[PDB]
Structures are given as structure tokens and as C-alpha cells.
Amino acid sequence: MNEVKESLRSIEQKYKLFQQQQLTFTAALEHCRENAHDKIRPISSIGQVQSYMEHYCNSSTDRRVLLMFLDICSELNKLCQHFEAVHSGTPVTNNLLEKCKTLVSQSNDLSSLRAKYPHDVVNHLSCDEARNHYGGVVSLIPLILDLMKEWIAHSEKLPR
Amino acid sequence: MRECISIHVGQAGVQIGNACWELYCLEHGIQPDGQMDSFNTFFSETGAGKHVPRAVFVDLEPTVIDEVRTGTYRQLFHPEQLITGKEDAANNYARGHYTIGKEIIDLVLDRIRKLADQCTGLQGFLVFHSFGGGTGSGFTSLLMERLSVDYGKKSKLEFSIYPAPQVSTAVVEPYNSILTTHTTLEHSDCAFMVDNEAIYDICRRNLDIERPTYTNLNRLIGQIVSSITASLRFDGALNVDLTEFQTNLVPYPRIHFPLATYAPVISAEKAYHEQLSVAEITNACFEPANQMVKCDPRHGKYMACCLLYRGDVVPKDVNAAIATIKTKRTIQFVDWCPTGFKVGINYQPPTVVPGGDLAKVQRAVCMLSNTTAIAEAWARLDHKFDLMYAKRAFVHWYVGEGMEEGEFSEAREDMAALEKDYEEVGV
Amino acid sequence: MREIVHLQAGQCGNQIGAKFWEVISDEHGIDPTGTYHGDSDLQLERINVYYNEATGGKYVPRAVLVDLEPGTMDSVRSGPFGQIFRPDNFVFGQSGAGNNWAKGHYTEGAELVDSVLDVVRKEAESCDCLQGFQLTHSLGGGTGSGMGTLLISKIREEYPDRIMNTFSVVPSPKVSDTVVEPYNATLSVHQLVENTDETYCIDNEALYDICFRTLKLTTPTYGDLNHLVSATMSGVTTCLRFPGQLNADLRKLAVNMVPFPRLHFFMPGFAPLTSRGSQQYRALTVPELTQQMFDAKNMMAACDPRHGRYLTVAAVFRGRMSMKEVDEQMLNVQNKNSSYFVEWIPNNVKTAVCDIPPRGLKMSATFIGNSTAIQELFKRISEQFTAMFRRKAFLHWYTGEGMDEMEFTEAESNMNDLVSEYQQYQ
Amino acid sequence: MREIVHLQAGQCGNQIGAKFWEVISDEHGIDPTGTYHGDSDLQLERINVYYNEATGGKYVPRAVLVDLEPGTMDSVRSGPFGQIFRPDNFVFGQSGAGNNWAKGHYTEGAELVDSVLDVVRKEAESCDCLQGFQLTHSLGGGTGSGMGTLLISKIREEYPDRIMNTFSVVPSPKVSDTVVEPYNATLSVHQLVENTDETYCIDNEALYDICFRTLKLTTPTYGDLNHLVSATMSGVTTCLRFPGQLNADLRKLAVNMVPFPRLHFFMPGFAPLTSRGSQQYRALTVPELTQQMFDAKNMMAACDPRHGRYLTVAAVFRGRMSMKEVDEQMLNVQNKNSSYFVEWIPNNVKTAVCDIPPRGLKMSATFIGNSTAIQELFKRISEQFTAMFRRKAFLHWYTGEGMDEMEFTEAESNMNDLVSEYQQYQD
Ligand SMILES: Nc1nc2c(ncn2[C@@H]2O[C@H](COP(=O)(O)OP(=O)(O)OP(=O)(O)O)[C@@H](O)[C@H]2O)c(=O)[nH]1
Numbered sequence A: 001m002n003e004v005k006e007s008l009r010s011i012e013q014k015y016k017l018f019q020q021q022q023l024t025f026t027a028a029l030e031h032c033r034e035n036a037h038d039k040i041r042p043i044s045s046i047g048q049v050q051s052y053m054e055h056y057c058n059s060s061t062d063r064r065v066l067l068m069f070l071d072i073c074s075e076l077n078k079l080c081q082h083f084e085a086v087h088s089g090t091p092v093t094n095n096l097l098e099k100c101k102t103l104v105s106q107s108n109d110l111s112s113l114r115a116k117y118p119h120d121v122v123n124h125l126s127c128d129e130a131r132n133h134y135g136g137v138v139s140l141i142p143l144i145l146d147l148m149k150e151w152i153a154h155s156e157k158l159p160r
Numbered sequence B: 001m002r003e004c005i006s007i008h009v010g011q012a013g014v015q016i017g018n019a020c021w022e023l024y025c026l027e028h029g030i031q032p033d034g035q036m037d038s039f040n041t042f043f044s045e046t047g048a049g050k051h052v053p054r055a056v057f058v059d060l061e062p063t064v065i066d067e068v069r070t071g072t073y074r075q076l077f078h079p080e081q082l083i084t085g086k087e088d089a090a091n092n093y094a095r096g097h098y099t100i101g102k103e104i105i106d107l108v109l110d111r112i113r114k115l116a117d118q119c120t121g122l123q124g125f126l127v128f129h130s131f132g133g134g135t136g137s138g139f140t141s142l143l144m145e146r147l148s149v150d151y152g153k154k155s156k157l158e159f160s161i162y163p164a165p166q167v168s169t170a171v172v173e174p175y176n177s178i179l180t181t182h183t184t185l186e187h188s189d190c191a192f193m194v195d196n197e198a199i200y201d202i203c204r205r206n207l208d209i210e211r212p213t214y215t216n217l218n219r220l221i222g223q224i225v226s227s228i229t230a231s232l233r234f235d236g237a238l239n240v241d242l243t244e245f246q247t248n249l250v251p252y253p254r255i256h257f258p259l260a261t262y263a264p265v266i267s268a269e270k271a272y273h274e275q276l277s278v279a280e281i282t283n284a285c286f287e288p289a290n291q292m293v294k295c296d297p298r299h300g301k302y303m304a305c306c307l308l309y310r311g312d313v314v315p316k317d318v319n320a321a322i323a324t325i326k327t328k329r330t331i332q333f334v335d336w337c338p339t340g341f342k343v344g345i346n347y348q349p350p351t352v353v354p355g356g357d358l359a360k361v362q363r364a365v366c367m368l369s370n371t372t373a374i375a376e377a378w379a380r381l382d383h384k385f386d387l388m389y390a391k392r393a394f395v396h397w398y399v400g401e402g403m404e405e406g407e408f409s410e411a412r413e414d415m416a417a418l419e420k421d422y423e424e425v426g427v
Numbered sequence C: 001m002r003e004i005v006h007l008q009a010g011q012c013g014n015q016i017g018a019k020f021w022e023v024i025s026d027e028h029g030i031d032p033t034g035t036y037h038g039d040s041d042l043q044l045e046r047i048n049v050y051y052n053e054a055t056g057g058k059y060v061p062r063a064v065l066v067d068l069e070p071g072t073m074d075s076v077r078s079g080p081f082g083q084i085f086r087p088d089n090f091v092f093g094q095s096g097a098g099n100n101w102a103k104g105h106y107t108e109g110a111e112l113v114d115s116v117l118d119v120v121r122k123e124a125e126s127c128d129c130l131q132g133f134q135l136t137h138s139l140g141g142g143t144g145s146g147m148g149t150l151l152i153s154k155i156r157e158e159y160p161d162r163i164m165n166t167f168s169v170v171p172s173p174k175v176s177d178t179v180v181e182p183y184n185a186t187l188s189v190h191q192l193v194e195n196t197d198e199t200y201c202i203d204n205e206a207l208y209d210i211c212f213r214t215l216k217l218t219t220p221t222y223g224d225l226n227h228l229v230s231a232t233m234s235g236v237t238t239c240l241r242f243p244g245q246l247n248a249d250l251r252k253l254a255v256n257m258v259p260f261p262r263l264h265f266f267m268p269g270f271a272p273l274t275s276r277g278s279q280q281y282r283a284l285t286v287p288e289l290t291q292q293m294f295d296a297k298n299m300m301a302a303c304d305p306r307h308g309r310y311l312t313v314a315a316v317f318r319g320r321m322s323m324k325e326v327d328e329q330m331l332n333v334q335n336k337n338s339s340y341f342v343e344w345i346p347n348n349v350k351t352a353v354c355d356i357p358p359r360g361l362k363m364s365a366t367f368i369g370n371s372t373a374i375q376e377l378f379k380r381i382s383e384q385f386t387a388m389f390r391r392k393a394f395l396h397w398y399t400g401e402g403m404d405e406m407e408f409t410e411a412e413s414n415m416n417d418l419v420s421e422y423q424q425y426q
Numbered sequence D: 001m002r003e004i005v006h007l008q009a010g011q012c013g014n015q016i017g018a019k020f021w022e023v024i025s026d027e028h029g030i031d032p033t034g035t036y037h038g039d040s041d042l043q044l045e046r047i048n049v050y051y052n053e054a055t056g057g058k059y060v061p062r063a064v065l066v067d068l069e070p071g072t073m074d075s076v077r078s079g080p081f082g083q084i085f086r087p088d089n090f091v092f093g094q095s096g097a098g099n100n101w102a103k104g105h106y107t108e109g110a111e112l113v114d115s116v117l118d119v120v121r122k123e124a125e126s127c128d129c130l131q132g133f134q135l136t137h138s139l140g141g142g143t144g145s146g147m148g149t150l151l152i153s154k155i156r157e158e159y160p161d162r163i164m165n166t167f168s169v170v171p172s173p174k175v176s177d178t179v180v181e182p183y184n185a186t187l188s189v190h191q192l193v194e195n196t197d198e199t200y201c202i203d204n205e206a207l208y209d210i211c212f213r214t215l216k217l218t219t220p221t222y223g224d225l226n227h228l229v230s231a232t233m234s235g236v237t238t239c240l241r242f243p244g245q246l247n248a249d250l251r252k253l254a255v256n257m258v259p260f261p262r263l264h265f266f267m268p269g270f271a272p273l274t275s276r277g278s279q280q281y282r283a284l285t286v287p288e289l290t291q292q293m294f295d296a297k298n299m300m301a302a303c304d305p306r307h308g309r310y311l312t313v314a315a316v317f318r319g320r321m322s323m324k325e326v327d328e329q330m331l332n333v334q335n336k337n338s339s340y341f342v343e344w345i346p347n348n349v350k351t352a353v354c355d356i357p358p359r360g361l362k363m364s365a366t367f368i369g370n371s372t373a374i375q376e377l378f379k380r381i382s383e384q385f386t387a388m389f390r391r392k393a394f395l396h397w398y399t400g401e402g403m404d405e406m407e408f409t410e411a412e413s414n415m416n417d418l419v420s421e422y423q424q425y426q427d
């Protein structure tokens, strides 16, 4: 479990960097939405975020932040395969693995997700902007980290 | 809360001090690299978890200070606490005391102030020297003159090395030891002495060693410093303070020179056979062979005794021992001190070292005793100078620095004034 | 109802103090955490003498501790039963004295006791009516003899008419553990005779003698020694806390055994003793106490009472026993021992009976005594003190701190009036 | 939000300004190209202070470099951080000042500055809330001194009420590396006192002394000399740009450090003089720091505190340190410095705490002060300037260009006016 845990700690450092650059990420998301001129629907797809970064990215720092966020998502997707082969698990473990796959899925939505109690992303982002436009993209990382910690605790409590 | 500050001046004091802090890290279980309450008395903490020793080594020659820098403990000692002397006094009292030492004595007080503000609570100062070295006799003298200026009442223990009665590695030692006693009388709080011959003699007949080094000497001396400071170092049944026995063991403003004696000096092969009772060790305490001052105890009169017991000792047979002691007629004390005894009891036994020659024993005992028999050694120190000063020997070396000519005889009158009172107080 | 305060002085006082509140917390059923768990309801009825009520059924001692060595106070902090003591009830100083009387009283005394009286008045006004004070001080130790007198002096000047019941350790022949002990002991008596209500001369040598000859322990460390000393204190102070068939509160105890305003030294004794040879061979009855009451093996002070007389003897017997059995055992020996007692005061013993026995024990007996055998202890203490001035030795530390030599001589004016007053009635 | 413009003159600050803009770019995580690769957005809120934005997400310098010798411009343009400055910031002339104040002022300076002054409106009018201007120059070099003081004249008249900060290197007692130093400095300080708000004095000799006695750097090249000078003025400006628990803007330092209008020469310092080999030997503690802000060695001029007189002191602390320990120890040191600080201004000092440290260091302090002994720095020039005019030296390089001899006699009176005021109000 330590081999996946090293990548988990690296992803924790990367998520800390993204939380520090949350304001820059929000500014980049607003600039991409203004360039795409489609503010009616909220951001819901990782594929939509990638398409926003490919064409509707304005600044070099914004492009770097979008690339860092996409690289964090790709590293999470790559570490999901290594976490899958750790243990066989129970039916609840399989359900949580399917939930992790759905959370890493680009086609699955993100607006219905919300930040956890330790996270302060809701306490940082704007009221209407996170309520209706881009709350889920900010909140997806901490819920995924909490689910990974819960899965690690479940595997630790589960006998091999 | 309590802390200890130690100053090492001279070639011996550096060489003696090397074995001392070797023991301190090993008793406290600290690696020489500087990492791993009871260590509060000797080490000041670094925010990364390191501890900086509270020891000051000042020497007028670099050849042994830089040797310490080549030791394994170079990752322990603070770089600014080692002061490199540009030129050595070379057993000339007036060189450091009047020409050479003024350049670097200003640097020493910067170290003292830096260590004092780091010290939130000060027990006292520890001073280490030998009576043969000019830096160990002269550079201390204007340091001990200086250490009275800033502080007047805090503890100052002048750990001394008395010259051996029959041998010496020096020639101008009767000049230097005379020049030592003038400053110690006027300024110094406490001063214990040992002589190299009895340190040579005990490791001959007790440890059965034919070929020691000076490290094999200084490992014994640092045990005494460990035993005296062990009350401040560790919680025990009867903890003592430096100011306590400075008030207690000293009788007079003139006489603050007691003797040192440690036990058990029993080797690792040797201790496996013995039966160690406290009555056994205290009967081994008062034998003249176990003292580290080669002078016959039956020449004078006993005045005081400090018995720093450490290990697993129960205070019953402690008291019956002194009662057994006081009955005998061979051991004579002074009538103006029928209460001439004090016993210290500390829980933790001393720790043996790898490569050492001592034994891992459950109980250890020290002796901090003053006796009027030391006049015979000091009568010799007056007589050796008298055989030297009659025909104006070696006067030219000291006077060339600038010190006056007739003031050599002033200390003779001052030494004889100290020697006059041993017939007054003693009789 | 009646509240009491425990002063403390000296490093040696800590080990006496820490074992004291260790012994008496057990006898009420208190854990070091501070949660009462016991069945006896009479303890909580009179728990307000010593402790102070806290939230959630916790109680905190009214113990005041003064010292100049944090290292033993750190041990008291790290002690097992020391975790019930109150934080500001500790009064600890950073600077030491050096086992000399002057440093604790004059130099370091000018600052630390201002932190003491604030702790006292904080504890004083929270009480109903303060019965008095206890201080465990010393005569051989420099700090305990030093501030203990100034602890006595300013409280007496602050509190006009109360009780002051102290426990002080006296010099001994063979357990001489300080050279300036005759210097420290004699001038401490100067502040005792004028200004102290009760002091109990416990001598170390008998404490060693009783653990060797009488309790027969193989390795009796000091924790055994303080186990006697604490129980001697509690025998004095169990009648104030516990009802008995014949109760005697401390004030009338202070009235009865203090006949004169000065000659109020006391010589304790407390012998429910049982050796490790003899758990079952004793016949634990009131008559065996009486033979053990006046045997020399049981008393706390290294003196032979056959060289004198007992002035006042109090025999508080605590346990289940009948008054007709109690008095008659002493009634016979008052008639029989017509020589060993004083003749100017007939009926030399007035007793007290307590019902509740100590925990871990069935029946126990105390002793409080003033006697006309304490001359030679006081005589031998004075004779070196005169002899230490002939050679004038060791006095320059006291002299060099700004003091007079006459203050060493004025005690000899006052101590000789103490020993000559014992000579008057003898 | 708050913007201030930097003008550059002389080859001196051309060597600081590459190192000085290294640190601010290092603090904001900026690559040598000029783009952003950082961790937080906190610096981006006030990254607009000394930059402007560019299209495509780029940040352009607010630093204009002017010299009459084009050699140092291109070297700065081709330096380690040479591809960052925008290419109209550089202005280069033809005939250098040649260490002559006259040459760079009237016959050659006037042709350059009119094109330079057009760059001033291009940079000033871009800023919304333009607080003022800074200028790094030299008193030893001709172009930095003579042409710099002309800029001091022209900018203040057109922009009257702003803040003018000058970080100027000053001539030294024993590192006098130009023959005309009392001619160059006096013809500038005649206009420096008149027309400058904030002036900072940098002594070369102390910088050599700092890197020797405490840093012990083996090869102190000018990259190391520019390193601390940049770091001191980096810590001055971080309270304007980076938020701290107790903040102070640039005018905030300007108002309180200046009691009288003609006394605005400041003496700075930087606190962590920690060596490369004894980082783990130092407890990273503010009780170490205060004796390091006020030691006999940590100053940056030839002005001893015992030869000086501390009117005002600003101690800008940088890093994560506690409030109470600093505030009491600042109260501590003013008390024990009874005769070192002045008496007619009680509560002399300002503490300043900025939360964010410099990179690679936990806590950091800058000691900035005004002392009368800057006149003792000046009296070395003053005893050298007056006697040199008596023997009629070097007039042809100056009086051959066209100024009358009378205002040179005004300067030795105007420089005498400055030292008269320090001496008058010293008592
Ligand atoms: N006990 C003990 N004595 C020592 C030791 N080393 C030297 N001595 C004694 O010290 C005396 C000389 O003192 P040193 O300190 O060696 O002389 P020094 O410091 O070189 O004096 P200078 O030449 O002026 O610098 C000799 O007579 C030795 O007996 C030691 O390690 N232990």
C-alpha cells in the first residue's frame, strides 16, 4: 500500500498547491467561460474542462494552472488502477471503487458534489459562483481525497 | 531550570576536559553527533533538536584545540566556543598575565555573556586547570580576577591539579604554583586538587595497569566532576547545591582547598569476586591508598568529609558507618568541628564506557575532604621555592614582560601568611 | 466548619509533605486523578478540614509549599500523588540558598514570600473559620530553618490568636548530616520558643533505629521513614476530623499539653508497629499497648527518659475499644510509676479515644509528650554552639552577608534562658 | 494597487539592480524570462507594485536604466537576468561622466535626460496610485552622482508631493577607490539634502567587513556584495507589498524617521548573519536576534554605536515569530541601552512584523536607523574636502566646464551646515 501511498502524498502536495492557486484557477475558469461565451450551463465535465483549456485558454499562468489541474486528475486516474489491484475487497469496497471510477469519470457530472467539513473551498469561493457555475470543479478534489482516505482505512481494517 | 558553566584553561584543562564531556553525553545517552530535563544542566538546546554543550575551552596554543576539532565530537562542540590562541605563553606566567593574554581575554567575556543570557538559571562556574602550565596558572589568574568583577557570589569551583610531591614534568612549577596561590586566595570560591602521582599510583595497584595514557588518567578525574555535579544532574534522595558545600566544606576565607578521593577503583575482572557493602566501601574510603593526593593522612587532622553516595544505597548503614568511623582513635578530627560529616545520596549509578577499564558496579562513592595534613605538601611548596630563590634563579624570564622584581617575595610573605595559620587554627 | 492550612519548607519537607498527603488521601479514598470512589460516608462529612471542594466531586489540598530547589519540586510535580496539588499552591523559587540560614531569610526572602501570602489569602478567605496552620520545617537544613521562621513570623503578625502546630526535625548524635547544623539549629530555636504554638521534635536516628531494630526491614529507604512521620502527624489530627468515644480537638490539646508560654516542645510517638517476623504472634489488645506505650523502642527522639521525667503525656488511642479498658490500663501505671513522671502535676495522662481505625490496620496508638529528659539534648546542642564561637569558625558567610555577630550571641542569651527554665523545675 | 517607479543611474546600481531584481523575482516565483511558476496567489495580489502586466499573461519590469557609457547597459542586457527588461527601459549616451560631476551634468547630461524624462511620463502615467519614485545611485561614480542629482532636481519640481527614496552607496574611510570622492560626494550632497525624501547610506568597507568576520565566505565576489545590499532593501519594501500582522508603508517609515527636514540619511543592517557551517549550531530564536541588531559588528557603516547616537530605529521583522516575545524584548533592549538611544524621544523604536519570510529562512530582521555618527562618516569627507580645496586640486576638470568658484565655497559651507545641525541638536 506504500507504493500507492507515495503517489497519494504527492497528490496531496499537488492538491495543496491547487488549493493555494484556487483563486487563479477560478479566474482561469471565468476567463475560459467568457471566451467560450456559454455561461448558461455550469461546468460539469472533465472533458469540457479539457476542451476549455485547449482552445479558450487566455493567459500563460491560466494555461499552467489548467495543465496542473488536468495533470492532477490524470494522476488520480492513473493511481486508481494501482489502488484497484491492492485488495479484492467486499461489496462495499467494490461499490466505493465504482464511486471512485465515477468521480474520476469525465462524462460524469460534478455539480451535485460538495466540499467536506475540513475543506474550506465553500468558505473561499463566491456564493453564486460556486452555487451555480463552478463549485463542483473546485470541490471534486477534496471529496476524492476523503474517499481515498476512507478506502485506505477500510482496507486497513479489512483482514487480508 | 538549573544549568552549569565550565571553563577549561591550559593544556591539561583541554586534555582533562576531553574526557569529561565524553562521559556527559554517554551518561545522558547522547550521541556525539549532538542528538539522541536531566540534560538541562549541561546542554543548551537547538530548535532542530540538537543540544549545545556549556563548556568553554580557551588555550593560548592551537595544537590541542584544533586536535579537538579533529575529534569525533567536532559535530558537537560549538565553533565559537573554541578560542584559538595566536601565541602560547609557554609556561611563562607573566606572558599571558601581562603581555599575551590581553588580546583574547576580551573574546572570552563575549563567550561568557553569550552563554549567560542563554542560561535562564545559573548554579555557578566550573574552572579547570593544572598547577604546572603557565596558561593554566597565569591566564586563569586574570580570568579569575575578571570573573569576580562581573559576578561576586555565584559558585566558582577551581578544579586544580596539584603537582606531585616527588615527580613533575616542569621546572618553573615552584614559581607558577606560588603565583597561582595569590589569586586564588583573593578571589576564588572553591578549589579541589589531585596530584598526578597518586593518579599514577592507584591505577598501578588497583586497576593493575602498567601502561596508561593521559586519557586513562582523565577518565578517572571526570568521574569526580560527575559525582559532584550528579546532585544537580539527577534527582536523588539527598540533592546538594554548589553553594551548599561551598558554604559547608570550606571552613574559612583562606582555606578553600580540600582533597578528592573516589571509590570503587575496582576493575571489570576484579569486581566480579568482591562483596560490595556500603560499610565495605566506606572502610575502603579512609585508607590512604585510595586518595588521589599523595600525602600521609596521619600528619594532620581531619576537618570535614563529604560522602557523595550514588547508586542503590539505603540510608540506614550510611549512618552506622560514620558512627563506626567516629569511634576509632587512629582517625583524628578537629575539636572545633564534631559535626564534620555530610552524605549525599543519588539514585543513578555511574555508567561505564566501551574501551574503559572500570567496572559496572551498583554503588559508587566520592570524598571531598579537607585536612590539615596538606600543610606538609605546602611546606614542600614553600621549601622548593626557598631552594630556588636564594640565588636569583630564572628571574630574567618573567621580568622581561614587565612585571616587577621584588613582588616575587611578596607572594612568599603571602604564602607564609597562609602557612602561619595552620599552627594557629591547628593548635 | 474548621479549616486548616499546611505550610511546607525545605527539600526535606517535600518528602515529608508528599508522603503525608499520600497517606491521608488513601484514608479517605481518593485517587491521584481526583475521583472519589469509596464506601465510608463519614470521611466526606469532615473532608472540609484539609481539602477544598472542586467541580465534579473533586477536592484539592490546602497545602502550601515553599522551597529554593525546583529539582525536588519537579519531582513533587512528577510525583504520583502530587497531581492532586493545586498549581499556584506550589511556591517554588529559581534561586537557591546554599544550606545557610541567611540566604533564605534576608536576600531571597525579600521576594518569594510576597508570592506566598497571596496564595495564603487566596486560600484564607475561601474558608469558613481557619483553625490554624501546620509547617514542616527543620533545624539542620539551611532553607527549612531559614524561611520557616519568617513563615512563622509574618503569619503570627498577620494572625493574632490561632493555632500554629509544626513538625520540626532535630539534630542527632550519629546522623549528623551538616557541619553548620549546630549553627542552623540553635538560632532557629530562637524564633521557635517565642513565637510557635506547637512543634514536634522528631529525631531521625530513632526513625532509623525503629526501622532496623523494631520494624526489621531489609532495605528501608526514606519512603518507609516518611511513612512513620506522616502517621504521627495524622494521629495528632484525627480527633479534629473523626468522631470518637473521647474526642479532643487541637485547641484543647494545645491548651492541655502547653502549660507554659515557652516550654512547648513536643516529643512524639506512634507505635502500631509490627515486624515482618511477627505478623501473628502479637496479641493486639489495649494492655499490650500500655507496655508498648512507655517502652523506649517506640518513641521518636533519641533520648533515654530514665534520666528525667515526663511532664505531660497524651495517649490518643484510635480504634474499637472500651473506655473502662482504656483508662484502667493507664490508671494502674500512674500509681505504679511514681518515679518516672513529674510529681507537681498528678494524673499525668489525659487521654482521647477515636473510633475509626486507619486504613490497612485494625487498632493503633499515638503519643504526645513534653518531658524533663530534653535538657541534655538541648544541653549538647548549646555546648558546641558556644564552642563554635570560641574559634569563631564558619561565621564569615553569615557575617559577610551584612549581618551582626551579636545575633549569634543574642540566641545564646535566649537559648540559655530556655535551658535554665528546664533547670528550674528539675 | 500601489505602484512606485525605479530609475537607475551609474554602473554601481546596475550591479545591485540585477541582483536586487533577482530577489523580488525570486520572492514572486518568476522565471528569468519573466513568466510565472509559483505556489500561491497571495503574491499575485500585490505583484503589480513593481511590475506591469503584458498581453499573453506576462509581467514587465518597472525599472529604467540610464548611463552615458553604454557598456554596463548591454552587460545588464546580456546578464544572467538580462532577457527580462523591456527594451525601451534602456537609455545609453555617448560620452561618459568619467568620474567627473561636471562632465555628466551640464554638457553631456542635458542631452540624455530629455529623452529620459519622456520615459518618466511613460512609466509614471501608467500607474494609478503612484506613491513616488526610487533611485539607486552612487557617490563615487560620476554618472550615478552627477546625472542622478539632476534627475532628483527635475522629478521633484514636476511631481511635488510624492515619496523619494534613494539607496546610495557612500565613500568609505579605507576603501577609497576614486581620487575625486570628496569632489563627487559634496557636489551631490549639496543637492541630496536639499531635494530628497528618503536617503539610505551604504558603506563599501562595512560590507567587506560583514562577509569576513561573520559570514566567513572564502571568495567574496561582487555577487556576494550585491546579495546582502539587495536583501536589505528587499526587506524594506516587503512591508509595502506583502501583508503582515503589523504593517508600515514607505511613507510610514518616512514620517517617523525624520524629525528635522535636513536629517534624512539612514543607516541599515540585516539580521541573520548565519554561517554556512554553523546553521545547526544556532538556536533560531529572537532572543538571539536583538543582540545581533545592536552588536558592535552588525552595522553597515563605519559608525560605532559608542561613537554614535541613535535617534530613531526601525526593526522590520520578517517570518513567523510570536508577538509578545518580540515586543517585550524590544522593550528590553531600549532599557539596557540607556545611553545608546536618545533621551528626548521616549519610545524611540518601531517594530514591524511581516508574516511571509524570505525564501529559505524561518525568521528575518532588518535593523534600520538614523545616527549622528553619519556625520562622523561625513567628517572624514569634511576634513578631507576642506584641506584639499586649500591646495587648489583638480579645478580644471570642473572649473574648465563653466561653473563659478563661489558655489564650491557654498558646498563646503552647506556640508558644514549639515554637520553643524547634528552637533547642535546632539545636546
Ligand atoms: N591530571 C592531569 N594533569 C595533567 C594533564 N596534562 C598535563 N597535566 C599536568 O599539567 C602540568 C603542565 O600543565 P599544562 O596544561 O600541560 O601546560 P600548558 O597549558 O601547555 O602551559 P603553557 O605551555 O604555558 O601553555 C604538567 O606538569 C602535568 O602534570 C592531564 O591530562 N591530567
Ligand SMILES: Nc1nc2c(ncn2[C@@H]2O[C@H](COP(=O)(O)OP(=O)(O)O)[C@@H](O)[C@H]2O)c(=O)[nH]1
Pocket: C009, C010, C011, C012, C013, C015, C016, C099, C138, C140, C141, C142, C143, C144, C145, C169, C175, C177, C178, C204, C222, C225, C226, C229
Ligand atoms: N523525616 C525526614 N527527614 C529528612 C528526609 N530527608 C532528609 N531529612 C533530614 O533533613 C536534613 C537535611 O535538611 P535539608 O534538605 O538540608 O533542608 P533544606 O535545605 O531546607 O531543604 C537531614 O539532616 C535529614 O536528617 C526525609 O525524607 N524525611
Ligand SMILES: Nc1nc2c(ncn2[C@@H]2O[C@H](COP(=O)(O)OP(=O)(O)O)[C@@H](O)[C@H]2O)c(=O)[nH]1
Pocket: D009, D010, D011, D012, D013, D015, D016, D067, D097, D099, D138, D140, D141, D142, D143, D144, D145, D169, D177, D178, D204, D207, D222, D225, D226
Ligand atoms: N559595494 C559596491 N560598490 C560598487 C559597486 N559598483 C560600483 N561601486 C562603487 O562605485 C564606484 C564607481 O562607481 P560607478 O559604478 O562606476 O558609477 P558611475 O561611474 O557613475 O557609472 C567605485 O568606487 C565602487 O566602490 C558594487 O557592485 N558594489
Ligand SMILES: [Mg+2]
Pocket: B010, B011, B012, B059, B060, B061, B088, B133, B135, B136
Ligand atoms: Mg598550554
